[PDB]
Design an enzyme around this catalytic site. Structure first.
Site, PDB file in Angstrom:
ATOM      1  N   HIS A  41       1.009  -1.345   0.065  1.00  0.00           N
ATOM      2  CA  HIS A  41       0.168   0.157   0.082  1.00  0.00           C
ATOM      3  C   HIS A  41       0.970   1.292   0.164  1.00  0.00           C
ATOM      4  O   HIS A  41       0.281   2.236  -0.056  1.00  0.00           O
ATOM      5  CB  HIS A  41      -0.982   0.132   1.135  1.00  0.00           C
ATOM      6  CG  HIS A  41      -0.484  -0.085   2.504  1.00  0.00           C
ATOM      7  ND1 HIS A  41       0.229   1.180   2.888  1.00  0.00           N
ATOM      8  CD2 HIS A  41      -0.571  -0.661   3.764  1.00  0.00           C
ATOM      9  CE1 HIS A  41       0.503   1.087   4.328  1.00  0.00           C
ATOM     10  NE2 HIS A  41      -0.008  -0.004   4.690  1.00  0.00           N
ATOM     11  N   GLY A 143       2.881   6.572   9.379  1.00  0.00           N
ATOM     12  CA  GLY A 143       4.274   6.377   8.922  1.00  0.00           C
ATOM     13  C   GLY A 143       5.102   5.131   9.501  1.00  0.00           C
ATOM     14  O   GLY A 143       6.049   4.928   9.092  1.00  0.00           O
ATOM     15  N   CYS A 145       4.231   1.821   9.328  1.00  0.00           N
ATOM     16  CA  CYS A 145       3.901   0.769   8.252  1.00  0.00           C
ATOM     17  C   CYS A 145       5.428   0.376   7.880  1.00  0.00           C
ATOM     18  O   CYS A 145       6.101   1.274   7.464  1.00  0.00           O
ATOM     19  CB  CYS A 145       3.094   1.062   7.294  1.00  0.00           C
ATOM     20  SG  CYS A 145       1.192   1.247   7.990  1.00  0.00           S
TER      21      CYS A 145
END
Ligand SMILES: O=C(C[S@@](=O)C(c1ccccc1)c1ccccc1)NO
Ligand SMILES: O=C(C[S@@](=O)C(c1ccccc1)c1ccccc1)NO
Lengths: 306, 306
Positions: A41, A143, A145
């Protein structure tokens, strides 16, 4: 003596963290040999995450659209591919700090350490367990991830988790390093609720053994029980059923302490039925379930990693 | 979202740990530039620790009696000296992995991370606070002496603790990196008891703010209080007295949440007087006091370190 929620030393993982930017989205990647791993993503906008078609969105991306930065140095991307829910970015330079490592898919009830990172930079380290409902109770902000979870055995880092999502209830979901989610979650901003958060019975027992080894023994009683009888209580309190396999794994802690596993089950049964009456156990006022039997042995014996 | 007991990334400290052996005693040392720092009781036998005269025992030791090993490599000792309760061993090679660092003596109530090590090798990392009685509640086994506690600000490691002793009650004592003990403890195996373990009020308040930021607000009430009134309650429950300096440090958390510091004191007062009635706050069934206001801001905002 003393017992703490302890994480593995994080240095070997710190050396693998990089920043990945696609378009206007920046998260963390994991640089091992000449491949950077990150959540797919990264290629989405906030609009995209409502109903993304990842294969279609990737068609518009080329190697040079993936900006990968390790510390102050830029890495050259020479190939890219999607595997389940992660992207693999081939770079022209092998990470010189690559530790010995493997990729492992863990079972519910197993524990691991998380290195929370932002913009490719480490922020902190803490210990987690894969819950029976396949979420983790972490500490993750926007942030984070691409931050990963891992275990270490002497010199080998076993990567087991990459962070992808935050559910509306504040708990967290993610994948193994092959990109397969733990549990039924998907990388979509939709209505996905967590199942029952059951307590990891075998870990609570191991922690009670840890307590005894460290001088907290007020909860020991005069009783014993059987697996079937205990499990009737476990069911009532949303505890995982205890199996003979669990009893076998607690054998070494039983041997060191001289307390039969089923006697410790009878102590746990009284604690579930009566509560702790305002007392504490290893500094906690509830029953801790994110220490495995291995974790207890490791901390109570001082295993190190070179 | 989510709030965890979080340690700093330990890699920069891992690169500093070495093994020190004198005679038959082996513990950990800290290699910074061309100096290794370690507890002076490395020169003692078990017999010696009952009543050691360190100056006299050191006379029998020469540079070549201190065996210093970094990983698999042996370091050449070219000088040695005693400073308070630590030894400084000069070696012929500057540690190439020396981070930017300082030595700091912390105040009671301040938190730090501990890298537990054995035989110069890292075992685990966890978070601690210097208690008001100048002990720490750690996880330390035999051979862990010389392990150190530290904070990080961007790129600078502030070393604040070196581990030296375990008291008979299972709590831990040690020094700053100049070798001065925290509190009244000495490196002697004698009768030294800890004072009252009072709760760090300002840290509990900061953790209640952390709770509110993360969705746990059932403990908010309709009341307020004054510093003097609250402190009458603090005294009863062995809490540290709250000062205006503490109120000022909680200002930013007050501003972000819109909850006046004295209103949060009134919530804490009700929690001390009534208990938590079997509920939890950020996964805990008691009031946590080892998060500072800085820790809360840092974790709730995602500060990183390069
Ligand atoms: O970049 C982030 C925000 S991400 O959590 C969030 C997302 C938002 C915008 C773009 C990509 C992903 C998302 C949404 C639905 C399912 C999983 C993840 N964190 O590092
Ligand atoms: O080497 C160890 C054991 S040490 O704790 C213990 C000691 C025992 C033998 C030799 C030196 C020190 C001691 C005793 C009194 C006061 C502080 C420390 N740990 O790493």
């Amino acid at each position: 003596s003393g017992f703490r929620k302890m994480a593995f030393p994080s240095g070997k993982v710190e050396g693998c963290m990089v920043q990945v930017t696609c378009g206007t989205t920046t998260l963390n990647g994991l640089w091992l040999d000449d491949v950077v791993y990150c959540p797919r993503h990264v290629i989405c906008t906030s609009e995209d995450m409502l109903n993304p078609n990842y294969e279609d969105l990737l068609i518009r991306k080329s190697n040079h659209n993936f900006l990968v930065q390790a510390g102050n140095v830029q890495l050259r991307v020479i190939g890219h591919s999607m595997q389940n829910c992660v992207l693999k970015l081939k770079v022209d330079t092998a990470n010189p700090k690559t530790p010995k490592y493997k990729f492992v898919r863990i079972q519910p009830g197993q524990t691991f350490s998380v290195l929370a990172c932002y913009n490719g930079s480490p922020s902190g380290v803490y210990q987690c367990a894969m819950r029976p409902n396949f979420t983790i109770k972490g500490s993750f902000l926007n942030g984070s991830c691409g931050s990963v979870g891992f275990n270490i055995d002497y010199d080998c880092v076993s990567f087991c988790y990459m962070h992808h999502m935050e559910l509306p209830t504040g708990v967290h979901a993610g994948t193994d390093l092959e990109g397969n989610f733990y549990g039924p979650f998907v990388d979509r901003q939709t209505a996905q609720a967590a199942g029952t958060d059951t307590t990891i019975t075998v870990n609570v027992l191991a922690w009670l053994y840890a307590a005894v080894i460290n001088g907290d023994r007020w909860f020991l009683n005069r009783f014993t029980t059987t697996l079937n009888d205990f499990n009737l209580v476990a069911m009532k309190y949303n505890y995982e059923p205890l199996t003979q396999d669990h009893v076998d794994i607690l054998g070494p802690l039983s041997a060191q302490t001289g307390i039969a596993v089923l006697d410790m089950c009878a102590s746990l049964k009284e604690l579930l039925q009566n509560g702790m009456n305002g007392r504490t156990i290893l500094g906690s006022a509830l029953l801790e379930d994110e220490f495995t039997p291995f974790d207890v042995v490791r901390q109570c014996s001082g295993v190190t990693f070179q």
